[PDB]
Design a protein around this nucleic acid. Sequence first.
DNA 1: AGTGGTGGCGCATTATAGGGAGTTATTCCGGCCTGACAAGAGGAAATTTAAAATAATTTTCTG
Length: 75
Amino acid sequence: ESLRAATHDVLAGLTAREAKVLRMRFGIDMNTDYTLEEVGKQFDVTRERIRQIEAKALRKLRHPSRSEVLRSFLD
DNA sequence: AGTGGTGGCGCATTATAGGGAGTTATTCCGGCCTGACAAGAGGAAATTTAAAATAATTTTCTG
């Protein structure tokens, strides 16, 4: 429960459509996950750019002080 | 000394195991979609240096 709350607020901390991308790529707060091509169709930009978005978001969250609170969930 | 009895084999009967056929259900084999890399283009923020002004140093002039 704590993890879902924290991940939701930290996603809220990031940009809008990137956040929606990351929610859709996974099952975060949503049902079955669609593969990259289908989400790209969802934005109508359907290609490697979507994984470019994924990698850029991951890179952007790599920076500490935001994820360390979530780092705690590792053990 | 002869008629039957004993053993072994044969004939008929009896018993047991393996193989084939089936059938089901687990398991291997292959194509196709995701996923990762390498490249390319156009446009915009950041940084650096050069030029131009206010506030102080130095020199000169005035009282």
